[PDB]
Amino acid sequence: VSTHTTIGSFDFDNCLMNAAGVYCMTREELAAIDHSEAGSFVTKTGTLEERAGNPQPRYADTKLGSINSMGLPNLGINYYLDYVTELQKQPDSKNHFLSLVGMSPEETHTILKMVEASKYQGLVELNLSCPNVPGKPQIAYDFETTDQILSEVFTYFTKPLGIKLPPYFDIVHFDQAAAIFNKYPLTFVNCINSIGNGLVIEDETVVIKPKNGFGGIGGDYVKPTALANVHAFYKRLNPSIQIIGTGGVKTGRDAFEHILCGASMVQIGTALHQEGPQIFKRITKELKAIMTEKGYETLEDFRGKLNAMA
Amino acid sequence: VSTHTTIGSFDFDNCLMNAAGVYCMTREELAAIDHSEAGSFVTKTGTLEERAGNPQPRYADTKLGSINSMGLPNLGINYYLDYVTELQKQPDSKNHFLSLVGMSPEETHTILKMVEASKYQGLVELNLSCPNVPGKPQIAYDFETTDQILSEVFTYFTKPLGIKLPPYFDIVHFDQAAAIFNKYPLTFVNCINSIGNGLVIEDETVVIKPKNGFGGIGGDYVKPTALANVHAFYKRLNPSIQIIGTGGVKTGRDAFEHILCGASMVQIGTALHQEGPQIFKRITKELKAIMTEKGYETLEDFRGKLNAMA
Amino acid sequence: VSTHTTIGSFDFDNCLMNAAGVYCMTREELAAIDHSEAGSFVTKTGTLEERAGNPQPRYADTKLGSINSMGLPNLGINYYLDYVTELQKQPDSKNHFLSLVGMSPEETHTILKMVEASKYQGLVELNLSCPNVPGKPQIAYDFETTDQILSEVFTYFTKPLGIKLPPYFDIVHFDQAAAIFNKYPLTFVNCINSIGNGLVIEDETVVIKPKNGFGGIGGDYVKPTALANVHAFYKRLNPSIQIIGTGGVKTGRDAFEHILCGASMVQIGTALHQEGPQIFKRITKELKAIMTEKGYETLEDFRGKLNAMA
Amino acid sequence: VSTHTTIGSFDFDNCLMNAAGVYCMTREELAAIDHSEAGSFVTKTGTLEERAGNPQPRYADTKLGSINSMGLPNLGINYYLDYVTELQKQPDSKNHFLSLVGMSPEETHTILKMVEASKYQGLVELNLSCPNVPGKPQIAYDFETTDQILSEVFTYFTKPLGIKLPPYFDIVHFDQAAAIFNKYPLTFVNCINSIGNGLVIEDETVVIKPKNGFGGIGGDYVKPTALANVHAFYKRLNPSIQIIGTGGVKTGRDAFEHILCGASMVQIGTALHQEGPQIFKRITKELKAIMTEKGYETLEDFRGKLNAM
Numbered sequence A, B, C: 001v002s003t004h005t006t007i008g009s010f011d012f013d014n015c016l017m018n019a020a021g022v023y024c025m026t027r028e029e030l031a032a033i034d035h036s037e038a039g040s041f042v043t044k045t046g047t048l049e050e051r052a053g054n055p056q057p058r059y060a061d062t063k064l065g066s067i068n069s070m071g072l073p074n075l076g077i078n079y080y081l082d083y084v085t086e087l088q089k090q091p092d093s094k095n096h097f098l099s100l101v102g103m104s105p106e107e108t109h110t111i112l113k114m115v116e117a118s119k120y121q122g123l124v125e126l127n128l129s130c131p132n133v134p135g136k137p138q139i140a141y142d143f144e145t146t147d148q149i150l151s152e153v154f155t156y157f158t159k160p161l162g163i164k165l166p167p168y169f170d171i172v173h174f175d176q177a178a179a180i181f182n183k184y185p186l187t188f189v190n191c192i193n194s195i196g197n198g199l200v201i202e203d204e205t206v207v208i209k210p211k212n213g214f215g216g217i218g219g220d221y222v223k224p225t226a227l228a229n230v231h232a233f234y235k236r237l238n239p240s241i242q243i244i245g246t247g248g249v250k251t252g253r254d255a256f257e258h259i260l261c262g263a264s265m266v267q268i269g270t271a272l273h274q275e276g277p278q279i280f281k282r283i284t285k286e287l288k289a290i291m292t293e294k295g296y297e298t299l300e301d302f303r304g305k306l307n308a309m310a
Numbered sequence D: 001v002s003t004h005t006t007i008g009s010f011d012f013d014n015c016l017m018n019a020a021g022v023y024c025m026t027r028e029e030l031a032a033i034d035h036s037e038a039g040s041f042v043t044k045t046g047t048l049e050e051r052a053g054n055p056q057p058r059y060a061d062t063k064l065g066s067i068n069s070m071g072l073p074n075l076g077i078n079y080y081l082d083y084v085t086e087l088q089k090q091p092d093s094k095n096h097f098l099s100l101v102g103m104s105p106e107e108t109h110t111i112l113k114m115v116e117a118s119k120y121q122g123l124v125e126l127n128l129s130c131p132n133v134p135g136k137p138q139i140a141y142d143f144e145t146t147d148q149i150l151s152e153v154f155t156y157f158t159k160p161l162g163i164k165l166p167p168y169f170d171i172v173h174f175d176q177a178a179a180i181f182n183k184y185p186l187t188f189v190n191c192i193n194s195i196g197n198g199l200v201i202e203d204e205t206v207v208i209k210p211k212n213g214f215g216g217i218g219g220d221y222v223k224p225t226a227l228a229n230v231h232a233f234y235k236r237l238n239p240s241i242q243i244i245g246t247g248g249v250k251t252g253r254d255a256f257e258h259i260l261c262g263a264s265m266v267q268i269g270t271a272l273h274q275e276g277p278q279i280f281k282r283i284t285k286e287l288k289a290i291m292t293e294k295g296y297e298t299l300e301d302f303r304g305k306l307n308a309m
Ligand SMILES: Cc1cc2nc3c(=O)[nH]c(=O)nc-3n(C[C@H](O)[C@H](O)[C@H](O)COP(=O)(O)O)c2cc1C
Pocket: A019, A020, A021, A022, A044, A045, A059, A066, A068, A070, A072, A099, A127, A129, A164, A192, A193, A194, A217, A218, A219, A220, A222, A246, A247, A248, A249, A267, A268, A269, A270, A271, A273
């Protein structure tokens, strides 16, 4: 019984890892991931220049999950780029994901062109739950802009590239998004980013400072949505585009369900934030237990094999 | 300490009621709501002709909430219309909500024109999470069609009308939706319908029969989203358009938070489905307790008074 | 023949040390300063959180000096604060300078308040060549904001504090700056930071990456300006505010001239960057030689005794 | 390969010349510039009435440059005005720059109005890098006064006019200065005047008499600042306002870099003071050499073409 897996041409000893933005601000945190039972890590989403992010507190936990409005705090793309480039050289080095996005499309290209010109050859995750022009929703909710960006990107970008996606909630939107993604040599899509713009109240006051208390929701609230997005894209995307599943994972069972829906790799945000890197050991065991009980030996035995009723 | 409230020019002895689709299929169920501590009821969403709805099972509970794909089963608009018209005449009659929608825009107009021509003078709730033409999302996710429908509707419809809305998850979508709704003499908006197209898995198999197991999510999963939508519209809509809050209500605290966000009336779906009409007694007590502890006497003392952080 | 000196109530075995930003990124570099003939060190200018600084190359040498646009890279205030706090405990510990600034006035106060609350009791150098709001020059070129900041700072800050200053070039500016500084219990001012926004060309291309090639100039270019600023403030500031002299020091003679102008302590940037900590040994000898030849025994014998022409 | 150039509607055989204040006190010195390889000259900065300037010594050299506090010594505006007016008539006459300023704004207008009413039609350089009123910095460091002066000036002054500028050291100041200058039909700006108020020490004593030893710095110290100012304005000013580059020029390479930054004309102060008019021959050759090696034929081939990394 093995939880080994692959994304594109890359192997991983395990199929659990951090979700972008969680436990990946610094070289130290990343190393802690790398030395945990996690199969990989993804860097903090990096922008062209470093960012302090939003005023505190910008994160709060709940009995059910979390709410956050970080504002893309990070030490700058160069910091993460150099670090993952440098880890390539070392032996026994795990494969990693470099998460990035610009505050504007132009900045996004500047960043990608840097990565293209660099010595990094590993996986890149473009975060499309990102800022657009005024009067326009986050980029992945703007199919015209999403298509335009991906089109431009692939005229120059040759490294393995996947995209981080916000959840969709309508069949027609899944169809439309997939018709776009299928055009491009994407290595993967990652479903899902937070459920956007939720509101959490403690007493009569919001629990985070930025954005009037509105923030991305993660954790238990999110699993039905996460699994739906993973499955919906699994059923729609050309098989050359793999799916990373993110959202609501706190047990091996949750990870199992993501893989069942089609995920090749599972990411943990909220629960990792709450439990620390030890969580990988625990969840890996819980997943493997389910596989054993089921007689599954590799992910391949059940990945995408979710059953309809009757 | 009073939980009386108003929507438009209508009074209610209480500010809790059923959410459309739950416990409102028949005259009997409706009467049970009417004789509970609920301040009102809303009818099953009625279509021009009666509908059987989707294959069973079309509803499942979870530790956290519910998932359903009913397919708008109902006894037909005439059934509910006649019933709520007839209740107007009776003494000690509570005000009610007639929920309706067509399977097509044309059908929707046919229905509204019937209600317009009828003797009913009470509140009407147009359900805008309704079927669109192929290649188009649910109507409320299609602002162009939403605006066109509401525009047509108000050229003839003179009765008090509110709209049932799906959740939005993007600031720009709130802005765009509000810019549309504000144009019209809407009595209220009702946030929110189910979180659309979630997926629930028991074992290795989806738990509902219709739509490959995809369905509307309600209950605990949904409150952050529900509260956000209520508040987001509260801060955007002209005050002549009130807000009914729906989603994640299972305690007085949950209702309290909805009212805090701006809701004038709170609806219960999943929890009512699980607990039965007795839930109103319980939740009313729990809400009143919070008001007492806080020194609030009417909803007016705290409605819309949600606080940002220092 | 002694080059001992004092700043406020603190003694130093020598009157030469590093300039902020040079050879002081890490505990290791600082220790190398501490074990050199330097009389003290000043930490890398620390911000609230660590910063990567600007893209490389961000520094270039010239036959005459240096040009740089670092962007305040540093390991964060806590790193330097803890380090100098911890050195206090040691015996034969030299007195040090903690350099700091926020990216915004509010951040500056947050940092100072941390230092105030800490166990550090040594000298602090607030770098007043920091970002201002848009359409506003560096802070020390904005007398209104400078006065406001210093005013706020001294309502809570009780530790010995000096300010690092950019050069001024106009008599009236010296007067205006001095009239502000004199109001406050500043321990010292440090003249000067780089000559701002110089441009160096190699062939037909600028020699640094950030800011279109524009950067702070240090080294030989700067001495006339540096000496002028030291002297100009020496002749204007209440004697309770001492002067640290920085700029263009590469020989004992240069240090000598700074002390002649009034400096109690002399700092080396560019030349230290070029020659390493060994430079203190050399320059100290060269200074002492001048003192010997002149019959001077302590700095007091010539400090501030620059002569006008007959 | 040609170092010809233009400022406004005026041509010059060469793109090197003296900086105001250096080698231009008298008709004789000016003529020596005119007969050198320099493409032009600018007169000593003239005031309404002649001035002796500050006590001596008011100038000192250094291994790196110079420091001075002249105090605007000059033979009076009328002396320079008459001389450049008179040179206009001659055939084969080079175009020149008449540098002037009043000790007060009112005096500045009186002078400009004289030039306006005169027969001189050549270039005028108004020196804004020197002070005027108390509790207030030199004029060009006082944007409100600078804008007021230029506004008044252009209600009456119709001759080609440029301004001599002190260096700025802040992006916002460049923006603010440029937002002023761009309003006006300035023919050019000249960057830069001395780095103000530097201090030079020899042994234990300042090396100039006036102002406690404080003075304008020129020469090697200044080039990074000079080039930055030239470039910063080049990138900001409407192209109808050309840039003359001054500061740190001692080789063809230095002049080359100024032109690269945007300068249409380059001026030499300190190095000219040190080497005499022969310097133009030398620097012209050194510049032309760089142009040849680069395959440049006119200034136009590289002016303003400085590259980022
Ligand atoms: C505190 C926090 C910060 C996050 N930051 C980012 C980010 O910077 N970039 C990104 O693409 N996703 C970011 N996410 C998205 C997480 O991956 C999100 O929680 C995940 O997509 C949902 O997983 P979960 O249910 O385990 O929280 C962040 C999530 C959290 C909780």
